[PDB]
């Protein structure tokens, strides 16, 4: 994508989203990041949507194959491994964009928290498939990224800010599903929900709708976990 203008890559990412062509969308947004300029809020959202859809399809396929393998010639394991390697490659690509150089240039809380949440998310997806001598280190990398994002969010954003809420939601999923810490997951979701509820009175109608949508996801997890 080096020969395409930044603005044209952004426009094509938006068209690829409308066309449900998420691999194309991710390639356009990687090209846009590699121009070297910081991303606006809307551009960060395009980057995250693109890779979430790509890695989401890979994770769903890995889970199907892993289930068949666990019920079970070499073919199911070989194909699960192929999908696993592809998934790992996408997560490494995202992590490499964050490390070269999105996080280090992000100075505002909204951008820095967003990118650190992404870093925690993509290490968490690596942790979902990890088994070898690096599973522990991958889990700690997710935890460290989420914890730095939490520390900034609590100091710099109100408790209803949607990024702060989505960070807390995903960190609680990390505790429940990856770190074997269901009580930490439940405590974080409950405290996050309660502190957001007490700040809703400060919001406009549209901000209220954005925050309460994410609060409902926290409630949905608490219903499954309690």
């Amino acid at each position: 994508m080096g020969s395409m203008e930044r603005a044209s890559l952004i426009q094509k990412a938006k068209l690829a989203e409308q066309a449900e062509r998420y691999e194309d969308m991710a390639a356009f947004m990687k090209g846009a990041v590699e121009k070297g300029e910081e991303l606006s809020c809307e551009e960060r959202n395009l980057l995250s949507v693109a890779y979430k859809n790509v890695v989401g399809g890979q994770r769903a396929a890995w889970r199907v194959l892993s289930s068949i393998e666990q019920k079970s010639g070499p073919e199911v394991r070989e194909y699960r491994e192929k999908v696993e390697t592809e998934l790992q490659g996408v997560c490494d690509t995202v992590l490499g964009l964050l490390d070269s150089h999105l996080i280090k240039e992000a100075g505002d809380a909204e951008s820095r928290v967003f990118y650190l949440k992404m870093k925690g998310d993509y290490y968490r997806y690596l942790a979902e498939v990890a088994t070898g001598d690096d599973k522990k280190r991958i889990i700690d990398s997710a935890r460290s990224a989420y914890q730095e994002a939490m520390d900034i969010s609590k100091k710099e954003m109100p408790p209803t800010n949607p990024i702060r809420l989505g960070l807390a939601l995903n960190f609680s999923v990390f505790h429940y599903e990856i770190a074997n810490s269901p009580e930490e997951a439940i405590s974080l979701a409950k405290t996050t929900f309660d502190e957001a509820m007490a700040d809703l009175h400060t919001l406009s109608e549209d901000s209220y709708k954005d925050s309460t949508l994410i609060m409902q996801l926290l409630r949905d997890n608490l219903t499954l976990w309690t």
Binding site: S48, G56, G166, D220, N221
Partner: peptide, 9 residues
Amino acid sequence: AGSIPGRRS
């Protein structure tokens, strides 16, 4: 359970 769906801009 559910992380942020995050699949639509």
